[PDB]
Design a protein around this nucleic acid. Sequence first.
RNA 1: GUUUAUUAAAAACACAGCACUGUGCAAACACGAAAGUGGACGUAUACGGUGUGACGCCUGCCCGGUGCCGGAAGGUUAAU
RNA 2: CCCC
RNA 3: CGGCACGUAGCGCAGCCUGGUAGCGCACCGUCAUGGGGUGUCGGGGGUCGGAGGUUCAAAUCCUCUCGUGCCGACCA
Lengths: 149, 77, 100, 271
Amino acid sequence: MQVILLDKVANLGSLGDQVNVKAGYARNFLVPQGKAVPATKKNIEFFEARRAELEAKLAEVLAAANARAEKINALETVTIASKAGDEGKLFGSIGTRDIADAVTAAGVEVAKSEVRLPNGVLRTTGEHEVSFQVHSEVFAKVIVNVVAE
Amino acid sequence: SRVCQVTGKRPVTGNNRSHALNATKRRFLPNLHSHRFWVESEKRFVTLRVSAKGMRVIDKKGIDTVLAELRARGEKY
Amino acid sequence: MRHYEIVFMVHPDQSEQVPGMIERYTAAITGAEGKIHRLEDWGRRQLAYPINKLHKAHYVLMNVEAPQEVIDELETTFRFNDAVIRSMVMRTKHAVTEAS
Amino acid sequence: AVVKCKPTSPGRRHVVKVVNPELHKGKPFAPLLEKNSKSGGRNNNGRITTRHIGGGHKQAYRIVDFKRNKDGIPAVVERLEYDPNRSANIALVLYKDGERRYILAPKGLKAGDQIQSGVDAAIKPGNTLPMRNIPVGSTVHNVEMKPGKGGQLARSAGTYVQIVARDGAYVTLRLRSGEMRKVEADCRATLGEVGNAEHMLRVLGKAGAARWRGVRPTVRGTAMNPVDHPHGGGEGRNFGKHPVTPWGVQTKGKKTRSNKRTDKFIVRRRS
RNA sequence: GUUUAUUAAAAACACAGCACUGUGCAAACACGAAAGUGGACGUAUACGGUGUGACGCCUGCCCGGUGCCGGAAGGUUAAU
RNA sequence: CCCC
RNA sequence: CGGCACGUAGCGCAGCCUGGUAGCGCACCGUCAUGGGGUGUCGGGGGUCGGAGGUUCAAAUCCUCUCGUGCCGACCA
Ligand SMILES: [Mg+2]
Ligand SMILES: [Mg+2]
Ligand SMILES: [Mg+2]
Ligand SMILES: [Mg+2]
Ligand SMILES: [Mg+2]
Ligand SMILES: [Mg+2]
Ligand SMILES: [Mg+2]
Ligand SMILES: [Mg+2]
Ligand SMILES: [Mg+2]
């Protein structure tokens, strides 16, 4: 209702600004994820002293690691071969666990939460595009080659 | 028991006076729900059985204070 | 073992991979000591009316001889998957190795 | 088949017994036998809930696998059996590498058949596979509602459900009541109808024929006395009321469905 | 076959059958301030309610009234 | 359209 | 009690505002049609728009009030 921002928001905020956001939006989503903090004097002092110039600017640094993981893949192409589904569809629909292991055993540091599928799960067989996001600011693009084992 | 874990709000009786004052008996209960608050000190969640006026009370106070209150009151969280 | 001229259409989707399907279509009969007569792959042509709202179709014919217990097998094979559509079978007549 | 019992005496004049000679007449497989204690109409608090119920012959619950999660191991049908629980015949089938297990009779199985469940299986009565790996327009039984619950749908004798369409990641189904719903496609089901398709015309001809099945008499209301049922009371068979439950609610009429938590799935209700 | 133990045992009750109606399963419905439980370790060839009441020939007209199911066009209409 |  | 909606020749109705000369079936009278008839046509009477008063250059069609006649809500001498 007067909450203070921790860093850049997806929308309606930039930094250190106070907004009449909704409680449903504040208690559940913002405050526990580290994107906002209620308007009290302890928090205002904390912000104007340790955040407006130090912690926000350190949060600007991890943008470097984000842009790094954006293109860490020396191949930028991951081939998965599981099984041929009778010349047609695929047996095991590739989701998030099928890729979070092929990336960790390949070197690209990506978690089950960093993957973002455009249209649900893929159930075809063919080399298709998927978008990766290591950060709300850094969106990568890595191609996948769907093969059969 | 339908009691707010944070305010002690409990059911209280009363009446149900009609348009001709028949005055049957009737209860009054809290808008009581079971929410999963966050606690940074512990970096955890905490499930309570609280009320709407307790939802705004933790907004005001803070989830640390209320916990010391409840601990000195002798109730498990 | 009887002479047949079984023909079928194919979706443009798997139309390009029909070479990979030819040998497996025909092996079920060849191992059965069947006789192939002709392999007319008419290919991609324009349909005459919308088949499930389509606009094209890949025609292929078999011109083969085979027994019933395996010809019915290949029939149900065509029918289970969704890559073949609107098939047809002939009976008992001699082979024709011409008439493209 | 159905046999019109010979009228030797009253109690057979109208009887018909659905009898199948192909099923086992010996004893069942104990390791899949659990006791099932009758609790006629009475819950943890006594105070009978459902009327019209009573005692009957002693049964024994058979451990039946609806989930069918062996998902890739063949199974040979050892034999059949008659479970007195549902309506249907059961099929005892043992897997290649050990375990024996019970399943439902899909109306077309005979002892010695080979089957298999899973996503890399064939299309034959008794094979169980996900609705995404299914040809639409088929006819199935033992359908799930969640991906793994096991099966809650169309498992009574003679029944089946005709898949009509697949809406992407969901599946439209026509139940054997007129309704058609929309469920998730990662569910699991078995092909073919279910056996004992002639239980529909299993006539009883006798009171005991039900009074030992478990049924207990249910009494008309306009005979009861008004203290016991709205329809009660009257000098000489006088209804003069509206047909309602014992508890006031009206029957022959009012729709009671008030869920709102599932109408997202119901496409077209029954009529 | 059952019933008015202790003035009525029957033409009354129930009955297998028939029909109607409800219920998609965390069912509908009942015992419960509730958690839960029976229904059912069943899932519409299943279950609950209602009525009539083996089998056989059959089940006529009326939707004005009441109740029930559909429509939201319009009039009326509570809190705030 | 009906009607001798 | 407040709000609304009906009322046009015997009947049933548009006209029920976007104010301009009361019209359309049904009845009724008369021709005509027919070999003799029914409908069919061409016509003829029969209404002052429930009453009252305003707004109006004009009413019906607009406002008010009433008289019926229904509906929905109200109502603790
Ligand atoms: Mg009193
Ligand atoms: Mg049972
Ligand atoms: Mg009965
Ligand atoms: Mg009488
Ligand atoms: Mg009477
Ligand atoms: Mg006695
Ligand atoms: Mg409950
Ligand atoms: Mg009326
Ligand atoms: Mg209604």
